Design a protein around this nucleic acid. Structure first.
Ligand SMILES: [Zn+2]
Ligand SMILES: [Zn+2]
Ligand SMILES: [Zn+2]
Ligand SMILES: [Zn+2]
Lengths: 201, 200, 201, 200
DNA sequence: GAACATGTTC
DNA sequence: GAACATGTTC
DNA sequence: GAACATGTTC
DNA sequence: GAACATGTTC
């Protein structure tokens, strides 16, 4: 019933938080997060872990969904999916059990459920909430992004926000955050160029 | 011929391959370099070539255009439309040609789009038609349906377009070839290649 | 139910400890431990003993598991196994009764049980806990690592953490530690180069 | 012939073995040293050779390529793909050649991959095909499927590739050979060997 | 990772 | 069309 | 164990 | 492509 996915930050009754672990300080590493820009620069198809933190545990069976959305108004109503070349190629989709049309995957979780909504057409991925590891702060989730932002046919050169929601089994939203995501072959240089440009300006 | 011959060959008939004066302007959708024997065109933008012949003979002769990757090492790969273009709609929808084909003909509606069962090679064949009364030579209007840059098709692997005049039985009569480059800026690209050529 | 093996240090209710006996001070010896880096440099296929110490004895039938895991996020979900050339070659697997696909073996224990998990696919080796030798501090376990870190097909050039867990018969974790493991043909030089580099930097 | 003859021999037909100009560039996937009579190629990267003949005779003649270790002392060992490559998927999956074979042919789909029952030797045979109309010589596109450095295959034991022109019955007509080196940097390796050659 | 490719933006 | 934007070669 | 091999990294 | 990384020869 939500043809515009909500994008606005919502700290839940549980202060829901999404953060990133030791991103490279090097241009080298395949993913990096700009705290300044609230932006993730990642590389196509590579593992990209996030940290969720909450102030109190949610009820059992609570889940965490990741749903990509186009940021610009003329694109906001366009469902974000894999470009046809990636969707129908050989490279990743055939081994994996996740559906080929999906942009966002989860690594290492076998309760992950890949959702295509019949009414809204939105593509998303859900995992059950797990409390952190014993004596730790954060619950880590491993994502894989399956097109570059640059990919034609797919989300071509349009910028996307990644919405992470904490949800009850009902679907009821208990928390929500988002950040801009960029998938490309040079996340360190791109991060610097954007940061340099933002600061110049 | 699992790998098609590419070096030039003339026929029984003068078999000329030419290009109308390309604009020397950057504002032209296509332009040809006599220097490099290279054609610069824009994706999906009709580009005319001139074949000219001296005799009109055999009763079912045809002319085919077949792209092949130029480097020996990429040469056994069939040149096709990238999946992204193949499956998109912008040009795929409404015409009478297979979406997987890189090369189309626009004027002839008796164009035959050929897929070799053994080699998988894709080419486009048209019947020879004598020129229009009072025009000197018959023109063939091609459409190139991916940029060379195209992703999952040819990725930035230069291609040579072989045009051959053929009898009904397949015997090769005339054949020529040139390197083809499909991009969004053929005039600038032409200029860079010719510059990077005189000294380099 | 643990597609990401826990890697975090856990001193159990028994202060569980994993240490190393007289590693060579020489470049010569086939294995060596860097206390600085928490890293074991060992040589392919050679005996590599460890010392476990506990502050109180655990209950009877407690076991000790060794499970290799890739350290880097994009590799973390990849099961660590022997490279095909080692797995299917003549050299060690045929004499030994341990399964050829396993990276980590135990020497000299006939209750060692080599586990391939049907749900998670993880490869590990378990032995029953033994109190130390009379009048001694530590219980020694003899491991054999069956690929170099450098081995292509196998864990090729990716770094691995070795997780040693103290476990009840149930599987319940009573203690856990880990260290980075490196298997190569020159552990002394490599140790020095890494130590030299860490200290420079 | 449990151990195959390796020294060069010519045939009834001019039997030339050549290489298209290799780039003198480091950026080429392969390059050949006329000096050492050594071919430097990259793993799995198609590399063309030129056989040329003067007469096209016998009705079922073929041309085989068979790798052999060059040192006398390693010579009785069959040259094969390392188990790591044999069992991996990256190239093993989707084509029509046994994974254990080091040498493949890419253009011919009538390639016959031979495993000698007595010697266990592996080679690849193709039928002689006359050149393409107007091209001068038929090209054969090889693929080398391990680096020489490859682990459990040839470990850093240099190999000589023997190419022989053969009648249907097996009688040896022409044969030549050269040393082959498969690695991730053929241009640099070429340069080091030729340098370590002029003075040393 | 610097320099280069090439398509889009304005 | 210059200037900017992105994946790729070296 | 120093010098050399050779493949990867950036 | 230079510089770094690893198993192997001597
Ligand atoms: Zn894509
Ligand atoms: Zn295309
Ligand atoms: Zn191994
Ligand atoms: Zn190999």
């Amino acid at each position: 019933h939500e043809f515009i996915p909500s994008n606005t930050d919502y700290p839940g009754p549980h202060h829901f938080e999404v953060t990133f672990q030791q991103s490279s300080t090097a241009k080298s590493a395949t993913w990096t997060y700009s705290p300044l820009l609230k932006k993730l620069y990642c590389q196509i198809a590579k593992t990209c872990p996030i940290q969720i933190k909450v102030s109190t545990p949610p009820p059992p069976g609570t889940a965490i969904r990741a749903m990509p959305v186009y940021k610009k108004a003329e694109h906001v109503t366009d469902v974000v999916k894999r470009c046809p070349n990636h969707e129908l190629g050989r490279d990743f989709n055939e081994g994996q059990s996740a559906p080929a049309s999906h942009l966002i995957r989860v690594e290492g979780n076998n309760l992950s459920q890949y959702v295509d909504d019949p009414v809204t057409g939105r593509q998303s991925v859900v995992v059950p909430y797990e409390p952190p590891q014993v004596g730790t702060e954060f619950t880590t989730i491993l994502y894989n992004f399956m097109c570059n932002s640059s990919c034609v046919g797919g989300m071509n050169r349009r910028p996307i926000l990644i919405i992470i929601t904490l949800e009850m089994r009902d679907g009821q939203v208990l928390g929500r955050r988002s950040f801009e995501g960029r998938i490309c072959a040079c996340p360190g240089r791109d991060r610097k160029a954007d940061e340099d440009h933002y600061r110049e300006q």
